[PDB]
Amino acid sequence: LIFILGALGGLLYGYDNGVISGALLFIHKDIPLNSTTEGIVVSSMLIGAIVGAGSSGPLADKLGRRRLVMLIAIVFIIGALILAASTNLALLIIGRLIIGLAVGGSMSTVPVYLSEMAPTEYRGSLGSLNQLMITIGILAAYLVNYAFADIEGWRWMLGLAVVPSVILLVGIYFMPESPRWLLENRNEEAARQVMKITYDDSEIDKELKEMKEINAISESTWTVIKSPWLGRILIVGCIFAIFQQFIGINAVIFYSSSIFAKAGLGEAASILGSVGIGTINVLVTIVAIFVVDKIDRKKLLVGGNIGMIASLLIMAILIWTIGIASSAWIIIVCLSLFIVFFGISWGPVLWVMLPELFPMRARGAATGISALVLNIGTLIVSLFFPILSDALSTEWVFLIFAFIGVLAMIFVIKFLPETRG
């Protein structure tokens, strides 16, 4: 219920990166100039993600949850509709900026007001349902996207990023006061209140115990965090965020659409190609909950780095072999083979270990930095890499990242495997 209506927001993360997948689909007749400053177009977008997400947690420390999350819904309608129009260097750089601050802000403030309204004991396989909600986000994203046939129409679909944002305006219009914000800030009244607003009186002395212990323990042991062994280990989870986001899907979907153009002369395969790619990825973000439990905590992510390195190997081969068309129908096949691997390990499973890895001591400042660095990753990707997809007639992409499947596989086996068997 209430959960699926916030899931419309996780979904919003989905449609946002799926309509810039679609923005790297429909770009050229909106006059980008060029794939390089499209690199800087998406660079602008995820920069917004960074100063926005950097600015997320602490701006939340100043002003509280409710009107904040609302303010961000407002930023979403505002931004999406602002980029429902395109004029100059200004509104491209700028529009991308505001929408990005909105994205970073979004996925950063979901789980904390989710922690305040929903008990700490609820973050599980249903939160993973929030992740595959991001995924179906991709579904209707590119679906609607190609489903429109000319120029002002995907700007119009930024407006159709507004329609949900205004029901995501409405999505946060409805919440009573911010409960665990109250619980930490000594105003505990309205906390205890919404707490009885929904589930009736039984377990809340112990759930009060639980989340008050998460904010009071984070507030107790953030004392040793700024500097060493915690700090160093976290910059390993940062270099992890790096080796992880670097053979990585965000920008990968952007130029998935982009060479769904730069390969094949007419876009019907930007529909069976894009919506196929992602229907597969929903299928896969769904096998998520299966294989977090099912397979293991290592050989899966290894196998992911592997199958990546493979579909990138053959695919790059068909690429230089001058066979860019066979490398295209097979681009579907190869890079979607790759898609099935991104899905079977390194989206959810890696993460499930990641908070499972630290002591129960702290989360927010730390994991939020691994965040900043991770985004940092995405950004270098989107910036730089669409630029050498334009020129080389490129064999280089998938090889450089098979060796990134390799140095993040080096990451894999000297850092989070277990050697034997």
Added chain:
Amino acid sequence: LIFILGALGGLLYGYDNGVISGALLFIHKDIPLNSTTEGIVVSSMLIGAIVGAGSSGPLADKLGRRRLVMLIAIVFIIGALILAASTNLALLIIGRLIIGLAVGGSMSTVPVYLSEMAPTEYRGSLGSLNQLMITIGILAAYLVNYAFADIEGWRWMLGLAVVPSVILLVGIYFMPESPRWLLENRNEEAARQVMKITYDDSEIDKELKEMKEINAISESTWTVIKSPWLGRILIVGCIFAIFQQFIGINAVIFYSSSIFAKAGLGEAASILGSVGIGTINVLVTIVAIFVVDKIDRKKLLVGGNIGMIASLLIMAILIWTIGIASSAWIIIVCLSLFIVFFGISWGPVLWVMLPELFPMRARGAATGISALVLNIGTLIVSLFFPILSDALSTEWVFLIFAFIGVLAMIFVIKFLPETRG
């Protein structure tokens, strides 16, 4: 038991390569110094194989076919009981040599002697039956090699190499004069009426016809052969024969009894590893009885060497991570793959495609010469490659052999057309 003891000529043949398998398991206890001389020794095998294989045919046109197949089986008794003792490296050089000459005699002579004494209605897909019995010869070869628990006992089993060496001989013991040898060389009386004894005179009008017709148009077409454009197609049927052995198990077999024990740490995995893997070979060869016709030959050479390079790299990074207790376990494995993709594809399929390439009417000079260049490949792998095994701790064979299955991935859709149509 005609084509059963003849195919026992096949099984002897492969059994020589497996012989060196249980060998590359027991090497260092025989007075070797060192793995390099192992290289020059299976080299010596395949050099005896080289002169023994070319001079099969012209010698067969000088002193006859019957005496020739017989003579070769005896080259088997000589080379094998010779190869059944040891003092210093000499009997290894000259032994693997004579043993070699007989083997070359097998591949070059025996299916054509089966071509004389049996109508031109057989040596095809049941010549592929001969293929089945040889992979049992190989499989059972190093199977028994590593069943015998000591060196003087597998020497006991090179005398036991003389055993099947003389049964094909027995297979040719009671045998009469060579029928199509008569049929082209003007002695044909016995040819016509042997064509009478074997298969009963109904189609042998059309078959005595088919082979005196092809004997005829061979008498007409061996002249426009040896120089350009036809020499261009033979040059590349020989590059066919080289990306047939630079990618293959004619190293990996014996030196996989080497890697299942000398990597695999105990030869336990030389029986389960090497023989077990050999039965995986047999599995995919039954798969070869059936998969001739339906999907493609070209694109499974494709997926084949594709997957060659799959396990080629996998092996490779599985090793640079230096996990070799567990990297060997996954190496019976990795192998099982390379052997399985080689199995779906280029052990049999390239070899049937050389008759499916060059004219119906002119075959022999070009396919036997393609075989000469073939063996050049095999022996290059023999000498050069296992000598590197005492050297670099290698990502490097199968990262190399990856690149081999690689330009073996590029030369396919760059050159090869498809043969079904």
